[PDB]
Amino acid sequence: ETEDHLESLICKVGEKSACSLESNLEGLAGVLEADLPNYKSKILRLLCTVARLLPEKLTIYTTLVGLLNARNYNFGGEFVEAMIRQLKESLKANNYNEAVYLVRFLSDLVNCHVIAAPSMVAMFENFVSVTQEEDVPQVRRDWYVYAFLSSLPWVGKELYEKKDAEMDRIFANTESYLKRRQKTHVPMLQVWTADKPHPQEEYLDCLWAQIQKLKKDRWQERHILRPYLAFDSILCEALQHNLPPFTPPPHTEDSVYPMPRVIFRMFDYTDDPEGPVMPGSHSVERFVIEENLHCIIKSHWKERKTCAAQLVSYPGKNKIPLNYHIVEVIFAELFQLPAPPHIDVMYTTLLIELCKLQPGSLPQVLAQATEMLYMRLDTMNTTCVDRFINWFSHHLSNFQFRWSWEDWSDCLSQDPESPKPKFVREVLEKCMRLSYHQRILDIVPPTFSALCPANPTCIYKYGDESSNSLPGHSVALCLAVAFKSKATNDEIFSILKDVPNEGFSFNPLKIEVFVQTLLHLAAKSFSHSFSALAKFHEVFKTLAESDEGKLHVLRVMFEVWRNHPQMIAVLVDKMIRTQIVDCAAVANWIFSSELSRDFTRLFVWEILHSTIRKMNKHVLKIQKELEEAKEKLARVLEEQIERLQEKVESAQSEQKNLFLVIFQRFIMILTEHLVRCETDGTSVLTPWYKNCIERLQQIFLQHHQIIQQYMVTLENLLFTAELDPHILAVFQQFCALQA
Amino acid sequence: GLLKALRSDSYVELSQYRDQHFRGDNEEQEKLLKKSCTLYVGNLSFYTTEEQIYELFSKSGDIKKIIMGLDKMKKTACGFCFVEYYSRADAENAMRYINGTRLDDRIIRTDWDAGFKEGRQYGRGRSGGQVRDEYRQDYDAGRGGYGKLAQN
Amino acid sequence: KRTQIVYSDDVYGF
Ligand SMILES: CN1CN([C@@H]2O[C@H](COP(=O)(O)OP(=O)(O)OP(=O)(O)O)[C@@H](O)[C@H]2O)c2nc(N)[nH]c(=O)c21
């Protein structure tokens, strides 16, 4: 297995070693030249792969290719050909994020005397000329500019020496493009609206400023490792290659571009005065550090111990406060809008594994960050706060819920609906769900017991202390007796006949005594409650066939379990899956007046989004049954495709009506608020409004791909010019994500 | 094209364990484990609720069923459970990021299971609890006390 | 510190 040996050698160069990086590269270059006779095929494929999947070690592998080009010109040429095939093929397949790494690899190959500087400037002329294409999306133009600008920390000096006139032109066109760019998306993607202590900048504005500072410093930067500089002798005698002319694959309607981004920023050098000086926001050093650290996480996300190791052992030309960069990059990913690159839970565990490797330094940085996140809560986007709450609570559960709560005493004098006390309330609630009510009461100071969650107990309407003058009290007691004694569906129905009040089918008291009682007797656990819903499923489906029946099941179920939101969430989930209720019912229930007082609480939105997700998966499932049965025809069954096509259309329709309902109810209550505020002259921006407008924002962020299907209907019928610009802004922001 | 080092996914590999009461070949058991969406969950507290396991294991995805590990005799929780997910991907993520973290301050340990059948919820040790709880010498407040030999 | 619950014999479309 020389094939496997070669992969392992190529991967292992650049990692921690007793010898120098230069020595290892020279050595490996020798070993690979020797194997070119009968492993050229393999070595090309491997180096093309590491160009695409290991951008974090870019300059190690460009140097390697440069040394191989010196010893064998023809090998260099085939590699450069393969890279261009790979680049064109990546763009064709909408892998724009892989394509950047390929563009940077080619760029830095100029510094290795493998590619002629003229070729690279010609390619970048064609990239920036995409800014003059007419009737194409901003996000297309953006990407070609970003691929250019983000390559310059590596190759910017060499190009601006060899062709300074041609680069000033490119820069001119780039600058005038950036000046006329629409920034509508920015408030939807910022983690904080406040521009102090750090503004959350738009990604291209920031990169531009970084490249401007780099240029002002004669293209000199203090971070990128450049192994090729120590092979100046060998690389200068090597002959260069020319890239073909590049024609960007033209914009089709099947083209899909990266969403714009906003750069996360919480630290500067003042947050670590003892340690090495942190590169500033507007330095390319900061860009390159964070880009590599993000890329390391991308490479090793599945292996939490490996990932932590690779981050801690990140090399640079100069000393940097690495623990701060690692923590900042992690929260940048976790709080990214619309969504993180990886599953949220991974970040919790990655930070644990980092604390394990760096127990003397990292935990203090993490606690310092946690302090700063809390103090900046007043303008944090709600979507990000939910994540902050879920991380912090889960983190605390892995370290004995130890936290200096009195540091956050400033929340106690504030309005309970303000971000800080709300944050603390929600965290403690989340802690309780991982622990138990008493444990959480114990781990906080007595000043904080006003913010603890209440005891998660059942509320039975027809219990001991309740008077027997309530409607259907005598029927409830009969149901209690029947349920305890293994009664059947018919016997329950029979008992429910003795209850007061198509042609007329919905009785609110039948539902009320049935639900109150059944939930009470299965209140022992989730498994018991689920078993009860299964056993008396036929009674549920008859009582709640009506749409007002479904809504009333949820109304009663809430009145029972309002102290135990976790229970509500799992019951609503089971009721949707067993079809007691439907998505539409849950949507209306959430915006109902009975939930009015709990509307700004996490659990409401956990339920909504969970409900939406079930709907989306339902449609996907039915869409795959259609696709599968069609491929069977392509190779009786034609009468089964017509039934599935009917099911897809009605499923897709249920999905669409779900979103339409949610948007209508949002538009209604937002308008109600805005009209009331223009009448009274009071502040629009209350805590309730902050939550409500940002929860609407979240529907778009979390489900942009599905909602893109409904653009024509939403422009024409819901989000029209008639709407208050406060509400319409959100929809315009949503449109900017792929405009 | 891919690199072996990056394809590495060691938290999702099969453990040493096999179910000895499994009606079938070993090759037939591995075939099910590689397709499973069900996880055995070890080293829980006896006092850890079903509702706590739901909250934690929900962080990797949507849970279909939790089957608590029960004492065969007493039918109380004896410190394991099963968690079944709707999708494989969500179970893989639990194995990657929930595996080896804390629940009621104990390092829980997850493994792929071949699938729930009746009787598998019950501890297979002499005394009713788990086999692991009989031979052990240590004192463990969260697992009854001393092991069942040294108790009585 | 807390009370264990006892589990019954009988406890185990869209
Ligand atoms: C340790 N266990 C225990 N277990 C299951 O949980 C139930 C009770 O386990 P147990 O009493 O510890 O039995 P046993 O498997 O003999 O334990 P062990 O071999 O550790 O001594 C059984 O259904 C058993 O198969 C397991 N299931 C899987 N998939 N993986 C595992 O590591 C384990």
Numbering used by the authors:
A (entry chain A): 26 to 526, 535 to 668, 687 to 790
B (entry chain B): 4 to 155
C (entry chain Z): 361 to 372, 379 to 380
List sentences from the manuscript:
The nuclear cap-binding complex (CBC) binds tightly to the 5′-cap structure (m7GpppN, where N is the first transcribed nucleotide) which is co-transcriptionally added to all nascent Pol II transcripts 25–50 nucleotides after initiation. CBC bound to capped RNA not only protects the transcript from decapping and subsequent further 5′-3′ degradation, but also acts as a platform for interaction with nuclear factors that determine the fate of the transcript. We also determine crystal structures of CBC bound to ARS2 or NELF-E peptide that explain why CBC–ARS2–PHAX and CBC–NELF–E form mutually exclusive complexes.
The best results were obtained with CBC-NELF-E360–380 and m7GTP giving P21 monoclinic crystals that diffracted to 2.8 Å resolution. There are four m7GTP bound CBC complexes in the asymmetric unit with clear electron density for the NELF-E360–380 peptide in one of them (chain E) but weaker in the other copies. The NELF-E peptide has a similar bipartite binding site to that of ARS2, with 360-DKRTQIVYSDDVYKE-372 in the proximal site and 378-DGF-380 in the distal site, and the bridging residues 375-NLV-377 poorly ordered. NELF-E Arg362 makes nearly identical interactions with CBP80 Tyr461 and CBP20 Gln55 and Asp107 as does Arg854 of ARS2 (left). Finally, there are highly analogous interactions of the NELF-E C-terminal Phe380 with CBP80 His651 as observed for ARS2 Phe871 (right). The major difference between NELF-E and ARS2 binding is that NELF-E has an additional tyrosine (Tyr372) which is buried in the interface. This tyrosine makes van der Waals contacts on one side with NELF-E Val371, and on the other side with CBP20 Ile70 and its hydroxyl group hydrogen bonds to the main-chain amino group of CBP20 Met71.
